[PDB]
Amino acid sequence: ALLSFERKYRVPGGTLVGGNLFDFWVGPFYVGFFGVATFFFAALGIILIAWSAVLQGTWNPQLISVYPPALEYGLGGAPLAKGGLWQIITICATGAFVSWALREVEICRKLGIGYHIPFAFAFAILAYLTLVLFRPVMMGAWGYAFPYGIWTHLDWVSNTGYTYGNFHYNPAHMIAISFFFTNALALALHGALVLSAANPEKGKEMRTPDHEDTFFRDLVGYSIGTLGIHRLGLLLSLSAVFFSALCMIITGTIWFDQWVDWWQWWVKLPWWANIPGG
Amino acid sequence: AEYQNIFSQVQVRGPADLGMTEDVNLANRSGVGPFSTLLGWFGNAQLGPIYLGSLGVLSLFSGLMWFFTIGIWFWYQAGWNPAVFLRDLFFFSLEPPAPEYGLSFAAPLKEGGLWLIASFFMFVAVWSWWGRTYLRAQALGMGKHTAWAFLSAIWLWMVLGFIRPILMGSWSEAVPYGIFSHLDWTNNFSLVHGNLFYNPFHGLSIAFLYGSALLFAMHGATILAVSRFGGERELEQIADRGTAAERAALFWRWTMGFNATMEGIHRWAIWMAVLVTLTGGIGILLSGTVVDNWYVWGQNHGMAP
Amino acid sequence: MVGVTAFGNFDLASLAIYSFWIFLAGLIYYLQTENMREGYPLENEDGTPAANQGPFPLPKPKTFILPHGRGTLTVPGPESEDRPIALARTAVSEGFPHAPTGDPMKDGVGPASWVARRDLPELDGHGHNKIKPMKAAAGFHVSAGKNPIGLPVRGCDLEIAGKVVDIWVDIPEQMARFLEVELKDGSTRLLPMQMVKVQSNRVHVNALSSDLFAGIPTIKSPTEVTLLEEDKICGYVAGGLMYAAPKRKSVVAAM
Numbered sequence A: 001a002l003l004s005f006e007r008k009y010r011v012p013g014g015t016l017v018g019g020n021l022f023d024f025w026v027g028p029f030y031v032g033f034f035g036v037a038t039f040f041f042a043a044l045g046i047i048l049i050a051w052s053a054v055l056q057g058t059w060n061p062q063l064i065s066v067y068p069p070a071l072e073y074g075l076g077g078a079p080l081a082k083g084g085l086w087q088i089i090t091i092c093a094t095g096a097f098v099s100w101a102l103r104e105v106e107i108c109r110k111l112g113i114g115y116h117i118p119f120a121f122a123f124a125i126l127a128y129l130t131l132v133l134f135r136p137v138m139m140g141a142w143g144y145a146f147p148y149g150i151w152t153h154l155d156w157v158s159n160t161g162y163t164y165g166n167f168h169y170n171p172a173h174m175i176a177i178s179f180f181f182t183n184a185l186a187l188a189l190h191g192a193l194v195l196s197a198a199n200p201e202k203g204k205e206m207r208t209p210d211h212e213d214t215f216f217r218d219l220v221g222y223s224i225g226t227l228g229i230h231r232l233g234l235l236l237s238l239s240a241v242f243f244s245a246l247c248m249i250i251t252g253t254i255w256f257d258q259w260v261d262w263w264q265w266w267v268k269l270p271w272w273a274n275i276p277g278g
Numbered sequence B: 001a002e003y004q005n006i007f008s009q010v011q012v013r014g015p016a017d018l019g020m021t022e023d024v025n026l027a028n029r030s031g032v033g034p035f036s037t038l039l040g041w042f043g044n045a046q047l048g049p050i051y052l053g054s055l056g057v058l059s060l061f062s063g064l065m066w067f068f069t070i071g072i073w074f075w076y077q078a079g080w081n082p083a084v085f086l087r088d089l090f091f092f093s094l095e096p097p098a099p100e101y102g103l104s105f106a107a108p109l110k111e112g113g114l115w116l117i118a119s120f121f122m123f124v125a126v127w128s129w130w131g132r133t134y135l136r137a138q139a140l141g142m143g144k145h146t147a148w149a150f151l152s153a154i155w156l157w158m159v160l161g162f163i164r165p166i167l168m169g170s171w172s173e174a175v176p177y178g179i180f181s182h183l184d185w186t187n188n189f190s191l192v193h194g195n196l197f198y199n200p201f202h203g204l205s206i207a208f209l210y211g212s213a214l215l216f217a218m219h220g221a222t223i224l225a226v227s228r229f230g231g232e233r234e235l236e237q238i239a240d241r242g243t244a245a246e247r248a249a250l251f252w253r254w255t256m257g258f259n260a261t262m263e264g265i266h267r268w269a270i271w272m273a274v275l276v277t278l279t280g281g282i283g284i285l286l287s288g289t290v291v292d293n294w295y296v297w298g299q300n301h302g303m304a305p
Numbered sequence C: 001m002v003g004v005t006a007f008g009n010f011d012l013a014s015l016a017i018y019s020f021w022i023f024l025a026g027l028i029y030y031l032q033t034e035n036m037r038e039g040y041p042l043e044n045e046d047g048t049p050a051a052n053q054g055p056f057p058l059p060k061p062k063t064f065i066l067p068h069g070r071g072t073l074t075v076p077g078p079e080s081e082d083r084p085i086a087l088a089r090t091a092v093s094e095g096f097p098h099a100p101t102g103d104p105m106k107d108g109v110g111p112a113s114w115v116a117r118r119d120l121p122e123l124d125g126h127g128h129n130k131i132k133p134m135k136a137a138a139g140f141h142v143s144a145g146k147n148p149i150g151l152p153v154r155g156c157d158l159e160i161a162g163k164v165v166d167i168w169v170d171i172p173e174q175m176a177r178f179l180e181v182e183l184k185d186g187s188t189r190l191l192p193m194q195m196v197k198v199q200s201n202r203v204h205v206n207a208l209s210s211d212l213f214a215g216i217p218t219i220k221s222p223t224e225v226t227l228l229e230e231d232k233i234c235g236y237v238a239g240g241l242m243y244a245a246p247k248r249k250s251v252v253a254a255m
Ligand code: BCL
Pocket: A097, A124, A125, A126, A127, A128, A131, A156, A157, A158, A159, A160, A161, A162, A166, A167, A168, A173, A176, A177, A180, A240, A241, A244, A245, A247, A248, B186
């Protein structure tokens, strides 16, 4: 089987593809349409990657990048060595990942489990494009996107952010921040919490959930419950990239310069402070 | 199917539960516990019980006293009254050393002196909570993974705020009390130190952040989708494993190549969240005491774009 | 100088990260693992000198002194199985799937699979049970929302799947779990809650049909459920979205 419980659950199901031909597991893994399709944009992925570095990129797969196209080439398809390889590598990227996603929809057909996990994954891809396609799209060229490098595309974040002054002064950014830290913390709490209900002291039994709700409610004043943390878990990370995607589509299209200023519509409003008393 | 995950649809009520509590109910019991309608759709309903313990109050004496010293401290640069206080708010802050100085309690109670005080009680407040998430745990049965967990969090606050800005000298450093400038800080903190982007700790910390992001999302998911066989009440499945525990197990196995247990996941969790701020403190305890410029390091070894 | 570095350029900071990094690799595979407490060891056979493969990072037993009653279950248990499982072959590779060999949902295989769970009323911190209708409760009230209980029940067919009579809510936690059904000519039958659309005048499902609602795991205990029971019925349903409609595991569209 490969596993104890494995066996029982291995039935020719899923197949969103056709009906087999590509319904088998190659080891622990599950080979399907999206299996070779993923291997598709992956192969050609690592196939191509290695190339733009083969040009006289350099050494240490840290400073070898693939800079996107140039900004006078604004929307067209550029040659190659001069940053066209981003177009070609990123087309396969999208295919590479989403297919990975669908690949999952299969897996969760014979187990006949939630459609959840996959759906969660997309909100994830969404960001990807808004940063690479969409933003660049509503702005001009496949140029207001990031290079593809380890220690390089970290220059895109500084330069672009700073562009605006103190991104920190961004509506959404700011938001996606709060959001990130919460769920950042939050898992550690349900995370550190469970182990504890299932592995107390060292000579004391294995407690009941009745204690989980009791234990926390008996902390801040509220304990939301099992399902809770798990729906919660969903939002928070989900939201992170949601309100996140939101600000970076507001800079350049919606906004000109100085992110702080934005916050000044509030500052110098007629009535000053708006609503003094008398 | 579904919709028994998010939305809920139905709602059951009645009596209210409450566990042992080795150490008294005196304080406990508390307030009525007025259920919440549309609160019970997304989560439970019951608001309360709630403790009102020993260490639980000082965090308030303190915590409160603190909040104030600030709001009272963003007076001098206010003139007073609502319009003003309602104009900025986000702008106000309570600025640390100025003539700089060092680790001297500085120039009087004035300058930077007040930072001094408010900051001191946040020490008290926050430390009094640990007493609670910690000792409060011995009364219900449960263990202190929690408390410990919350200890890495005290590290970051500790360092950047108290521990960190001293191994150097000058109190000048350290995070001011605000909403807008306390932002500013972070920004000119990296900026002084080349770029906190070449700092290995902050970076792995960012590495870790997304990892808790990756992992919480996924977790809530692999459980909301198995919740059909009650993939939740994990603690029970930790005891005697159900097909739900597996079904989930099996999914990422035939996808990534490896599966855990309805118990390791939460383990990978605590762990992820923790290593978070953890490295970020190590990375702070070291920024300014061993490196004034980080870019150098990178191109002083081999890494940089 | 730079009262930091150690040699002709060997900063204290350098090893700091090597310390962290490897010792990090530490946790992972070992401590942070423990992900082998279940589904381990793995399934091997009988042959020649040495068997062609198997693990060894495998930790130690972790005795769990259960909530109430006799509490002793070290996770690193033998486990395994070998209980009735009717899954035949298809090809020659240890990937090539295995097909049903009878009644799929009826058998105990595939997207409609139950484990071999302990036989006992889940739990309850104050000793009792959890899972229980309201015909037993006293004080519990289903507020104005959706009161089946005499409300219709259907599937893909269309109607008379049965009527209602109650709900199995979370006594110790506060929340609805199962729903009581009676096929008119079949008294007991409690579907999940996590798969049946509730509304007004209809309580549409999806998993099954009023054609399969008869032959679902039955509760031998009137007003009492045990772990084992939950999963069977629980797998039963979920398994309609593939086994039910004969052609539900197949295609949809092309490419
Ligand atoms: C000086 C520079 C600025 C700045 C400029 C920017 C800019 C510019 C950006 C951010 C962005 C972000 N910033 Mg900022 N930022 C600053 C300071 C901060 C601070 C802080 C403590 O001060 C914080 C907490 C943050 C936090 C954040 C995040 C909320 C956000 C990116 C997260 C995200 O959605 O990733 C999501 C990641 C993805 C969606 C990646 C998806 C890729 C696909 C899906 C995966 C592919 C599969 C893989 C290849 C296969 C793996 C194979 C394996 C090898 C086996 N910033 C400073 C002040 N910040 C970004 C953002 O979202 O904009 C707001 C952004 O563009």
